[PDB]
Structures are given as structure tokens and as C-alpha cells.
Amino acid sequence: KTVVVTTILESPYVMMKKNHEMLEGNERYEGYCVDLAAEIAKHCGFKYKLTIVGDGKYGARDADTKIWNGMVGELVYGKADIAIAPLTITLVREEVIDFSKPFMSLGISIMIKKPIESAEDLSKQTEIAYGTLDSGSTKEFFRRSKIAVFDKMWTYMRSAEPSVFVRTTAEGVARVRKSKGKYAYLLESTMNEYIEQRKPCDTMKVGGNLDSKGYGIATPKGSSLGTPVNLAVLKLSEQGVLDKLKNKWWYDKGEC
């Protein structure tokens, strides 16, 4: 029985190769998660077939219908056997499915054009604007935060004219690059570093992470792959394979 691996199209995790039209099968894709899936299969000795999620969403439960969609929905309704992709380990997902130990740590970071070196410095001043998405984990973190620094950051953002929120990460990066140093973007650190290593190389990551999260390999609740997959993730972390894969797809392939 071939293991159905559900993934998502996100760079540099899973992306189509340049000559993907000629190729077929698992050779159509490449990226960090493709190598991770290959290593996981090698450790556990199974045959897998990569599949891009049709919905194109990471996974959430609709309020009115209580129906999961995306990768989490595919795992819940038995449409896939494993999800090797940057899926964030959250409470509701852990309630509905199984997560392995995180294979990549991340957090909320600050993006500026290549004056600010910390979140506290951003909160103190008012010349430089900053914002997040109109909805998502980062905005929810800022809205609910009880720490004084993040509380005043959220108070400024909620009371900023014009609105500092952006509809998509691409819009935020574009505003950062077009604001000539008068706007800052708050986003995941992994995406921050990835964009930092892209042309035209005009953005940079400043300061530490405002919080801590992780990407975990997801397995259906009650499946037999959970323990071997978790052990494989720990083994890959301990031999440093995950460090090498991160360096390859972020800095070795960087264009800066």
C-alpha cells in the first residue's frame, strides 16, 4: 500500500521544477519538504506518492459546519496518510490529529528595508509604521497579548490611520519595499529569512523572535505511522540532517 503524502505549494518547501512538464511522479516537485519526505520514507522504509492539497489551504474548521478543510481535513477524513509540510502545531489541530516533534522552530519577526533592532524599539518610536495581516495567528497573538510591549504595539496598530494591515504576505513585502524604510512587517521568521535571501535583496530581519512556534509532520489520529515518524524526526534532528536541509534551501540556494 503506497502512502499518500499530502503537501502544499509553498516555497521553499514544495515547488514545481523548471522542467516539471516533462517529468512525472514525485520528480515534478522539489524543496525542503520533498527532501524531508524522502528521508522519512527512507527511515521507515515505505513507498510514498506526493500529492498537493486540492483546497490549497493548511487546515481550519468552519464555524457554522464544523468541517475541517485543507491538509487537516484530508487527514481527518482519511484522504491522506501523512502531511509532510510546514503545518503549525496548534491546539485545535492537536485535538483533531497527531503531530510529531517540530522539525523547524520559528516565530514572529520584524521585516525592514535594508534604526530598529528590537520590538521594544519599534514600540517606543512612531516614525516607522508596522502592521500584520488583517487576520491570522500573528494578529491574534497581538490582539490577545498581555505583555505591556505587545499590548501597546496592538493598541497603536488598532488605532493607526491609515490602516497598517495587509491582505497577503506578498502585499506586506511590497509595502515594505515601496515604503523606503517607513514601514515594518511582522511575519514568520522562516518566511522572513527566505525573502531576505531573494532578489532584489533589499529587506532584512532585525531582532529576535516575538514568540515560539513549530512545524510538525501530521498523521491521522490513531494511525500507525505516528511513533516511527516521530522517532525519524528526532533522529534527523540529532544527526543534523534538518540543519543541512535548512541551510541548503535557504542559504545555499539563496540569490543574495
Ligand X SMILES: NS(=O)(=O)c1cc2c(cc1Cl)N[C@H]([C@H]1C[C@H]3C=C[C@@H]1C3)NS2(=O)=O
Out of 51, 169, 223, 237, the only residue in the binding site for ligand Y4Y (CB under 6 A) is: 169
Cell of 152: 501597546
Residue with the three cell numbers 483546497? 55
Residue type at 44 in one-letter notation:
C
Distance in angstroms (rounded) separating the CA atoms of residues 23 and 27? 6
> Measuring CA to CA, which residue among 65, 66, 103, 76 is closest to residue 87?
103
62 in contact with a copy of itself (CB under 8 A): no
Rg value, the chain, Cα: 19
CB of 106 to a copy of itself, least distance (A): 10
Out of 58, 99, 103, 150, the only residue in the binding site for ligand Y4Y (CB under 6 A) is: 58
Query: Was 100 annotated as part of a binding site?
Result: no
> Measuring CA to CA, which residue among 76, 24, 69, 88 is closest to residue 50?
24
Query: Was 137 annotated as part of a binding site?
Result: yes
242 in contact with ligand X (CB under 6 A): yes
145 in contact with a copy of itself (CB under 8 A): yes
Q: How far is CA 115 from CA 58, 119, 149, 165, 195, in A?
A: 35, 12, 18, 22, 20
239 in contact with ligand X (CB under 6 A): no
Question: What values do phi and psi take at 199, rounded to 5?
Answer: -65, 145
Out of 207, 214, 228, 254, the only residue in the binding site for ligand X (CB under 6 A) is: 214
Distance in angstroms (rounded) separating the CA atoms of residues 40 and 228? 9
- Give 36 or 53: the residue with its C-beta nearer to a copy of itself: 36
Tell which positions 185-224 bind a copy of itself, by CB under 8 A: 211-212, 214
Query: Was 86 annotated as part of a binding site?
Result: yes
Out of 81, 133, 246, 249, the only residue in the binding site for ligand X (CB under 6 A) is: 246
Pick out the residues of the known binding site: 86, 88, 93, 137-138, 188
Pick out the residues of the known binding site for L-glutamate: 86, 88, 93, 137-138, 188
Residues at the site binding ligand Y4Y, with contacts judged by CB under 6 A: 10, 58, 86-88, 137, 169, 187-188, 190-191
